[PDB]
């Protein structure tokens, strides 16, 4: 019972906000990632890295504020405050995009800290660590999108900027440049996210509409007690209903709740794999057979060829302002356009 | 020498068979377009 | 359409190999019961 055990004792005291050993990593990094984002979106410009206003101070609103990525000329610099680019000048550090690496790096270590917290609390309380395992899916998404993806590209500049409309721009970039909707790993992610939301709604509704009458009130919430041994709804009636409505139904309460873990976690993991490919521009952009036929046969048209024309418009029309370091000058006559528009 | 005592039977119930076949068939339906390309 | 020829063999084995695995495991379960 030395100083280590005495510190263990204090970290694991049952208090309003549990601390734990994991709290030493989690709480500084979470607070700084969050405080960095609120500071930047309130006060900090993107004029020197993007040619964009991005703070409330500059006139932006909650949808258009962002902590924007550093200039392309920084490469993948860590952009440490004390590093060779800002050289300890706090003001220059903000203007060069240092808050972006600050937030991304502290956010990453905060995510680690949060998953360790899930492990730590589960061990102390005595439950299996499946909530921590499920949280692997948000972690894979964050690291694949915010770190691996720009590390495969020319610079951090092409990572997502931390803002509502900046993320909207990220979506559209990925359509026009990567044809990301065509990518089967994203499609598997879509099915996991929408399948998860389906399972969430259908399961909640089923329980609430197969309840046992355990009180007399019209509000049925009051008729549950957290220490009761009895199931509060009828699995047997729920199974009959869904078997006759949909053909098949759950019959095992454990499988059902595991499947609810499984579906959205797996979906997110699949999309992360696809973004890892896009780090290398390894896209599912084209179908070669469609392109060979369409090049030879000007009457052949599909929704696939229709969408590539859309992608080509996006690229030519957004690239000069979206990639200002490239000094794209596209004269009017080269811009792709249909008739009249 | 004794027979090995760590051996265990393996099971796959009918519901798991239906789930697995559905997984494989739907994955094949999804990826086949990209294999033909 | 000028599709990748190996797409057919790739697709057929993608279906067949894991499906056969599951069928093997299921049938020998049933003959235990």
């Amino acid at each position: 019972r030395g100083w280590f055990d005495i510190l263990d004792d204090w970290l694991k005291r049952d208090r309003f906000v549990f601390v734990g050993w994991s709290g030493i990593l989690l709480f500084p990094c979470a607070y700084l990632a969050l405080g960095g984002w609120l500071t930047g979106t309130t006060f900090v410009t993107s004029w020197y890295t993007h040619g964009l206003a991005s703070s409330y101070l500059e006139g932006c609103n909650f949808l258009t504020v962002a902590v924007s990525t550093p200039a392309n000329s920084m490469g993948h610099s860590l952009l440490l405050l004390w590093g060779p680019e800002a050289q300890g000048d706090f003001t220059r550090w903000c203007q060069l995009g240092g808050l972006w690496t600050f937030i991304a790096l502290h956010g990453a270590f905060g995510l680690i800290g949060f998953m360790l917290r899930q492990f730590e609390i589960a061990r102390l309380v005595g439950v299996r660590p499946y909530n921590a395992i499920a949280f692997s899916a948000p972690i894979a998404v964050f690291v694949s999108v915010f770190l691996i993806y720009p590390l495969g590209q020319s610079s951090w500049f092409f990572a997502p900027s931390f803002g509502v409309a900046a993320i909207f721009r990220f979506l559209l970039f990925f359509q026009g440049f990567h044809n990301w909707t065509l990518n089967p790993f994203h499609m598997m992610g879509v099915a996991g996210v929408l399948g998860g939301a389906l399972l969430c709604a259908i399961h909640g509704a089923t329980v609430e509409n197969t309840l046992f009458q355990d009180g007399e009130g019209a509000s049925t919430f009051r008729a549950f007690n957290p220490t009761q041994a009895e199931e509060t709804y009828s699995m047997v009636t729920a199974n009959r209903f869904w078997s006759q409505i949909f053909g098949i139904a759950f019959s095992n309460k454990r499988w059902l709740h595991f499947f609810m873990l499984f579906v959205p976690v797996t979906g997110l993991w699949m999309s992360a794999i696809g973004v890892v490919g896009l780090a290398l521009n390894l896209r599912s952009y084209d179908f070669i057979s469609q392109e060979i036929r369409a090049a030879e046969d000007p009457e052949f048209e599909t929704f696939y060829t229709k969408n590539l024309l859309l992608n080509e418009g996006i690229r030519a029309w957004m690239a000069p302002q979206d990639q200002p370091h490239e000094n794209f000058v596209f004269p009017e006559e080269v811009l792709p356009r249909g008739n009249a528009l | 020498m004794e027979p090995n005592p760590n051996r265990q039977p393996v099971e796959l119930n009918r519901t798991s068979l239906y789930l697995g076949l559905l997984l494989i068939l739907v994955l094949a339906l999804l990826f086949s377009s990209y294999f033909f390309n | 359409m000028e599709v990748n020829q190996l797409g057919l063999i790739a697709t057929a084995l993608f279906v067949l190999v894991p499906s056969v695995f599951l069928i093997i495991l299921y049938v020998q379960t049933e003959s235990q019961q």
């Binding site: 047997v236 199974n239 078997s243 053909g247 098949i248 139904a249 019959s251 | 119930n13 009918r14 519901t15 239906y18 076949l21 559905l22 068939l25 739907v26 094949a28 339906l29 086949s32 377009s33 033909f36 | 359409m1 599709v3 797409g7 057919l8 697709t11 057929a12 279906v15």
Partner: peptide, 30 residues
């Protein structure tokens, strides 16, 4: 051959639907 393949896989899924509904393992109470 690719049309045949797509349709074949789709037909197998429909047949699987039939067995999964009408030849499921019956849920038995307690």
């Amino acid at each position: 051959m690719e049309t045949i393949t797509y349709v074949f896989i789709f037909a197998c899924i429909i047949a699987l639907f039939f067995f999964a509904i009408f030849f499921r393992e019956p849920p038995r109470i307690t």
